[PDB]
Design a protein around this nucleic acid. Structure first.
Length: 672
RNA sequence: AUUUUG
């Protein structure tokens, strides 16, 4: 019914690369973008289902976004600023997702930036060499400041005094400077002995001022401006588990006696500043809802219906939203740390979507979860490199085959917590395709086939993975009396009845083999470049003829469909060559990585392309229907949703998986 | 300290 996005992961090790404004809206830096999430009643979710929605992206930086800050000035909550390793500081209007203005004043890698709470157009940025720029964006003025020759980690403008900014450095130095007096140091706050991760001013004025600092030294220090000195030192607790530390802080403006911090392992704490190091652990009652790795940023968000929320970003690649009233996790938004290479829906558990990602974890998204739009489980054991191919077993629950960029083939039982079985035989190169099919000699119900970039297809016994795997080229050569070298295989696809195997090749040909012995019956010579994808039409359409239709894509843009009824039904004694397509689907402008048939229709195909779009075709009428342009990157995979005829999932090298509706797209065909 | 080639 509504689209969904699994976004790229929040960036790591940035003191402020996320923020939120009331109502409201949360933004997070992820790779070279900022993603925007509506949270609360404005998102428009059914009661019970978490009230958030991914709504937009700020696109325009060309390198890692290192900083993000909204304006917190009433009437301009739509303005924000970013910093980037591209050398720029950009001011954006999130209503239009466009840049208002920008500067390139820094000459060294920017560390962070902050929008002044007191001055409407002032953004203060700091870099790795210690240079600070004050930028009044709406009068075209700027001033450089240089305090100490040390790498800036964090900086926070005072909420009460427009001229005062606190800055924390890599060596543990903290200073309060006056920006109206050339950055003169007003207080030097001596105490920490390692990186400053966070500085939070006390949200009430006077005691002067209080400031809290969090450090890699595992302490939070509370400081007095009037004394120029530490008034309180809190050492983080050592708690049982449920990288080094990142210690970030949130000092709630409506509960000034409480201070929230991160902790070892990504636990969150609410400290009682009235008390003996008293804290309360977030999620102390419920199990498994805490982060599992360090938390980098904490962002308060008060919704329109006055719930107090706190958003957290983490090295574990989840964004969590915490209900401050109960300290329990309201919801979790998972994210991706690499390309989305592969998508596979289970035929056994409807709606269970495996995703192969370049960050070395398999995701299993329960897409049909009633109360959770983003119910995703992670599988990391035995994976350890980019997961470039996946295929669920067609009948055994939980049985997931996978393949990696290092040539490894494994088999998961996703219903257990056991590590996967690993094939003893490796491909020389990347595993591009996995498929289940009947066994063929010399193997003695389904075998697992794997195809590597080197061009070998292996047949594995899924009961004895650590045993022998067979190169099927021996059987092909014997059964067909072949004398010259076999082609370099680049794709395997079994027809839905299990009787016919198609192999795509580097030279563009597609060969059609029949069981039991992989007797060659047809060579299709249509593509002239490497075949990336083959898919046979399903068996439950309105005509039986349709299950003989085979779609294919190559490094060229044009897609072909072939109808193999006549050849398959004649079982010829010597093989036929086909050189004319049954249908031709033109429109894309770059290589085709994946094609899939709709299980809801007769002869409806979706294609994914390096042109950055996905295209729905009425293949039988050679008619382009719907073109999705939501990705920023090159598409690598596509799969139709199993229950909604209007909904498709696609994955790309933008580190995104999108779930989208054909009915909501405004174009019928790919860009020219 | 992750952010890259079906």
């Amino acid at each position: 019914q509504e689209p969904r996005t699994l976004p790229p992961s929040p960036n790591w090790y940035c003191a402020r690369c996320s923020d939120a404004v009331p109502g409201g809206l949360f933004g997070f830096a992820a790779r070279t973008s900022v993603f925007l999430v509506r949270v609360g009643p404005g998102a428009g979710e059914s009661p019970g289902t978490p009230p958030f929605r991914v709504i937009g992206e700020l696109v325009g930086h060309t390198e890692r976004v290192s900083g993000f800050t909204f304006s917190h000035h009433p009437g301009q909550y739509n303005l924000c600023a970013t910093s980037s390793d591209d050398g720029t500081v950009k001011i954006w209007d999130v209503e239009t997702k466009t840049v208002v203005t920008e500067h390139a004043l820094h000459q060294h890698t920017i560390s962070t930036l902050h929008w002044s709470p007191r001055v409407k157009d002032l953004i203060v940025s700091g870099d790795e060499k210690g240079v600070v720029f004050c930028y009044w964006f709406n009068r075209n003025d700027s001033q450089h400041l240089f305090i100490e020759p040390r790498t800036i980690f964090c900086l926070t403008c005072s909420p009460h005094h427009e001229d005062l900014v606190a800055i924390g450095y890599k060596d543990g130095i903290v200073v309060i400077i006056d920006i109206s007096k050339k950055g003169e140091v007003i207080h030097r706050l001596r105490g920490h002995d390692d990186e400053i991760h966070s500085i939070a001013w006390c949200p009430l004025p006077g005691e002067g001022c209080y400031l809290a600092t969090g450090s890699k030294d595992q302490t939070i220090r509370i400081w007095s401006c009037s004394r120029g000195r530490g008034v309180m030192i809190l050492k983080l607790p050592f708690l049982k588990r449920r990288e080094r530390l990142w210690l970030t802080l949130h000092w709630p403006s409506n509960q000034p006696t409480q201070l929230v911090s991160s902790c070892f392992g990504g636990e969150l704490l609410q400290w009682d500043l009235t008390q003996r190091r008293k804290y309360t652990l977030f999620s102390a009652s419920s199990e498994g809802q805490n982060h599992s790795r360090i938390v980098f940023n904490l962002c308060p968000l008060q919704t329109e219906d006055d719930k107090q929320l706190l958003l957290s970003t983490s090295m574990d690649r989840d964004v969590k939203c915490w209900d401050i009233a109960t300290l329990e996790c309201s919801w979790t938004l998972p994210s991706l740390g690499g390309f989305a290479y592969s998508l596979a829906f289970s035929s056994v558990d409807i709606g269970s979507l495996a995703i192969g990602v370049g960050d070395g974890m398999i995701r299993v998204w329960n897409t049909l979860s009633i109360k959770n739009n983003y119910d995703v489980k992670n599988f990391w054991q035995g994976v350890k490199s980019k997961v470039t191919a996946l295929c669920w077993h067609p009948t055994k629950e939980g049985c997931l085959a996978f393949g990696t960029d290092d040539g490894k083939v494994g088999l998961y039982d996703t219903y257990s917590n056991k590590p996967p079985q690993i094939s003893s035989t490796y491909h020389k190169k990347t595993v591009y395709t996995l498929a289940w099919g009947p066994p063929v000699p010399p193997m003695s119900s389904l075998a697992l086939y794997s195809c590597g970039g080197e061009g070998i297809v292996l047949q594995h016994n899924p009961w004895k993975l650590s045993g022998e795997a067979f190169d099927i080229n021996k059987l092909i050569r014997d059964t067909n009396s072949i004398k010259y070298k076999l082609p370099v295989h680049t794709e395997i696809s079994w027809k839905a009845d299990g009787k016919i195997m198609a192999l795509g090749n580097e030279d563009g040909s597609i060969e059609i083999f029949q069981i039991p012995n992989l007797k060659l019956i047809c060579t299709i010579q249509q593509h002239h470049k490497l075949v990336n994808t083959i898919s046979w039409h399903h068996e439950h359409g309105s005509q039986p003829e349709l299950s003989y239709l085979m779609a294919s894509g190559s490094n060229n843009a044009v897609i072909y469909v072939h109808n193999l009824k006549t050849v398959i039904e004649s079982s010829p004694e010597s093989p036929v060559t086909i050189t004319e397509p049954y249908r031709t689907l033109s429109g894309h402008t770059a290589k085709i990585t994946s094609v899939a048939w709709s299980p809801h229709h007769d002869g409806r195909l979706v294609s994914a392309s390096y042109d950055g779009t996905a295209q729905v075709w009425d293949a039988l009428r050679e008619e382009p229907l719907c073109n999705f342009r939501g990705h920023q990157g090159r598409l690598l995979c596509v799969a139709w949703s199993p229950l909604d005829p209007d909904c498709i999932y696609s994955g790309a090298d933008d580190f995104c998986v999108h779930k989208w509706l054909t009915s909501m797209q405004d174009h019928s065909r790919p860009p020219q």
